[PDB]
Write a protein that binds this ligand. Structure first.
Ligand SMILES: CC(C)C[C@H](N)C(=O)O
Length: 345
């Protein structure tokens, strides 16, 4: 019979563009797998849910998935929405592979039904700190975050990494997500002669912060995690996007092996350049590899099979550890430009 698979992420809310990549990658993977014969004759069917990357809505979607009879879940997208949903899935015995959540706490609580194809912030954070200490070498640093699990976790990780080398972190503060007016922050950066800022958060706040800093002549160097590295960033920031540092996953769309999938996305007039297009495609490929190899429909047996044998996907040969995290998922550093393009630094 038809194998149903929930795909869960942001189809609405302020970071819906990340979700656009997720659903584009999932749809294409489900379509390619069915085109080659499915899972031993059976058809994969994606069932799409919108949690809006919001903790409360995520708990509502997870509850609905249990009630709908679905046993496998590619989601959720954000860390703050994925973690509370995983509590429900673990209790009900449902497989959950997150293509987007990078916060470490997800897979550090003994949950047996939980995996991910996204990286870890326990590696993205230290990658930023290393680059700050060794290449940028600023005199005076401020670290800002958006008071949510992903951004605040990365901001705290960069604070610790810098403080390990006794770098001058002048101050550490948060701003509320959805902020329009950053004039108070900018005034503090001028007062404290801050020449470098790490922002933990997503692209809507990064964009407006960059534009407003340059409008009054701040010469500050900014940096953020992969959550700011979006096509929207330079549209919001304008010329202030130039020089922006950001940690991102490898450019999977420039891998020759993925050129067939790039061409399929370009035929549907879709942007193939986003990291989570590929990381989500990979999560469907891992679920399909486990169903095919074992011939089983038990969530626990599918996870054990993946931890043991791995899977060959569009983001490389995947090798999970006992907790459900990928081993050897590396972030690189990129200089952003005003036209939305970027180059490795
Ligand atoms: C899509 C990504 C920007 C999501 C981010 N890694 C998080 O855990 O919230």
């Amino acid at each position: 019979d038809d194998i149903k698979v929930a795909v869960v992420g942001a189809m609405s809310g302020p970071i819906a563009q990340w979700g656009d990549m997720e659903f584009n990658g999932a749809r294409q993977a489900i379509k390619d797998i069915n085109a080659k014969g499915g899972i031993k004759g059976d058809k994969l069917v994606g069932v799409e849910y919108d949690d809006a990357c919001d903790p409360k809505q995520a708990v509502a979607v997870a509850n609905k998935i249990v009630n709908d009879g679905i046993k496998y879940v590619i989601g959720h997208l954000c860390s703050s929405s994925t973690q509370p949903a995983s509590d429900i899935y673990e209790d009900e015995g449902i497989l959950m592979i997150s293509p987007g959540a990078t916060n470490p706490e997800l897979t550090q609580r003994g949950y047996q039904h939980i995996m991910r194809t996204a990286g870890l912030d326990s590696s993205q954070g230290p990658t930023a700190a290393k680059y700050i200490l060794e290449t940028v070498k600023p005199q005076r640093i401020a670290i800002i975050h958006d008071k949510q699990q992903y951004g605040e976790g990365l901001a705290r990780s960069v604070q610790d990494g810098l403080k390990a080398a006794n770098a001058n972190v002048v101050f550490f503060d948060g701003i509320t997500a959805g902020e329009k007016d950053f004039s108070a922050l900018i005034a503090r950066l001028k007062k404290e002669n801050i020449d470098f800022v790490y922002y933990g958060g997503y692209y809507p706040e990064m964009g407006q912060m960059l534009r407003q800093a340059r409008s009054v002549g701040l010469k500050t160097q900014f940096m953020g995690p992969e959550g700011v590295g979006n096509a929207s960033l330079s549209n919001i920031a304008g010329d202030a996007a130039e020089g922006m540092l950001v940690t991102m996953p490898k450019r999977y769309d420039q891998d020759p092996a993925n050129q067939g999938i790039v061409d399929a996305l370009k035929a549907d007039k879709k942007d193939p350049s986003g990291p989570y297009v590929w990381i989500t495609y990979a999560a469907v490929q891992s679920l399909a590899t486990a169903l095919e190899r074992t011939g089983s429909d038990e969530p626990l047996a599918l996870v054990k099979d993946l931890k043991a044998n791995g899977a060959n996907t569009v983001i490389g040969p995947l090798n999970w550890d006992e907790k459900g995290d990928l081993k050897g998922f590396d972030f690189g550093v990129f200089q952003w430009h005003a036209d939305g393009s970027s180059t490795k630094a």
